[PDB]
Amino acid sequence: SDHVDLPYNLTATKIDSDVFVVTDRDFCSSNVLVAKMLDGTVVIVSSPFENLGTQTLMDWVAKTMKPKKVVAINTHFHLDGTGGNEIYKKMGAETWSSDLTKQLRLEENKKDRIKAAEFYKNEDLKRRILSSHPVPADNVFDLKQGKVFSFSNELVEVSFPGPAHSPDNVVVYFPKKKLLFGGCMIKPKELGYLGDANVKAWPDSARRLKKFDAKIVIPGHGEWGGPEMVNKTIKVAEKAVGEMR
Ligand SMILES: [Zn+2]
Ligand SMILES: [Zn+2]
Ligand SMILES: [Zn+2]
């Protein structure tokens, strides 16, 4: 079948033999891409919110893919992005983000934990959030220049299309699979949490994603789709600009 149910309400859904989406349903249905490169390297894009979810994800990756190496790419500084870094590191993964994402995560870490913890209503989820201590990635590239990974000539392209959902949001493109992980700047129905959003910039940042020849676009939350995901996002952001003036 199309998915496997994992502990802590994680879902792992197959897109093909070498591409999976793992969804943290407990924490806002956050999507994590897991792509196995031909040379055995596993690339993970984004993260579950915290340690229990991330440990569950890594246990499943270990069991099912037995990777030679794991490379984890943070999409932005939010917990669906950096929440996995502690456990990724502990498990021997190489964690990556832009320099801005690291900076924003470090700044976010200075803020009051217990006050920001009442943002969730369930007490078990609160205790899971408070039990984790998010850290930035170990390896950093310059936001504006992006980064292209080459795993035995299999390319993974990380680029900054401009501020949208957050000032630092990047997308990850896999040209071999024509797959774009757009992350939380892909919002085909409604923009969602705007705490760090640049609504005025969002339509043009999303327009810049049209350059990718994507057959599959994976959003940070919710069902994935095709290139129309980008078009839907642009209109949703425009309506927000329209009301906002
Ligand atoms: Zn199921
Ligand atoms: Zn976010
Ligand atoms: Zn998100």
Numbering used by the authors: 31 to 92, 95 to 220, 224 to 247, 250 to 261, 290 to 310
Question: What do the authors report?
Answer:
The São Paulo MBL‐1 (SPM‐1) was first identified in β‐lactam‐resistant Pseudomonas aeruginosa, and SPM‐1‐producing P. aeruginosa is endemic in Brazilian hospitals. SPM‐1 is a particular challenge from an inhibition perspective because it has a broad substrate specificity (catalyzing penicillin, cephalosporin, and carbapenem hydrolysis) and has properties characteristic of both B1‐ and B2‐subfamily MBLs. SPM‐1 resembles B1 MBLs in terms of its di‐ZnII ion requirement and (based on available evidence) with respect to its kinetics. SPM‐1 has unusual second‐sphere residues, and is unique amongst B1 MBLs with respect to mobile active‐site regions; SPM‐1 has an extended “α3 region” (residues 223–241, BBL numbering) and a relatively short L3 loop (residues 61–66, BBL numbering), which are features characteristic of B2 MBLs.8a No structures of SPM‐1 complexed with substrates/inhibitors have been solved, though structures in which the α3 region adopts open8a and closed8b conformations with respect to the active site have been reported.
Residues in the L3 loop (Y58) and α3 region (F151) were selected for modification and labeling with 19F. Selective labeling of Y58C and F151C SPM‐1 variants using BTFA (Y58C* and F151C*, respectively) was confirmed by intact‐protein and trypsin‐digest mass spectrometry. Notably, the naturally present cysteine (Cys221) in SPM‐1 was not observed to react with BTFA, likely because it chelates ZnII, as evidenced by S‐carbamidomethylation of Cys221, but not Cys58 and Cys151, in MS analyses of Y58C* and F151C*. The circular dichroism spectra of wildtype (wt) SPM‐1, Y58C*, and F151C* were similar, thus implying similar overall folds as supported by crystallographic analyses of Y58C. The combined biophysical and kinetic studies established that the properties of Y58C* and F151C* are sufficiently similar to those of wt SPM‐1 to justify PrOF NMR studies. Consistent with the crystallographic evidence, solvent isotope exchange studies revealed that F151C*, which lies in the exposed α3 region, is more solvent accessible than Y58C*, which is located in the less exposed L3 loop. We then tested the utility of PrOF NMR for monitoring the binding of weak SPM‐1 inhibitors, as exemplified by avibactam, which inhibits class A, C, and some D β‐lactamases,3, 4c but has low affinity for most MBLs.4b A clear chemical‐shift change was observed with avibactam and Y58C* but not F151C*, thus indicating that avibactam binding induces changes in the L3 region but not the α3 region. We then investigated the addition of β‐lactam substrates [a carbapenem (meropenem), a penicillin (piperacillin), and mechanism‐based inhibitors of class A β‐lactamases (tazobactam and clavulanic acid)] to the SPM‐1* variants.
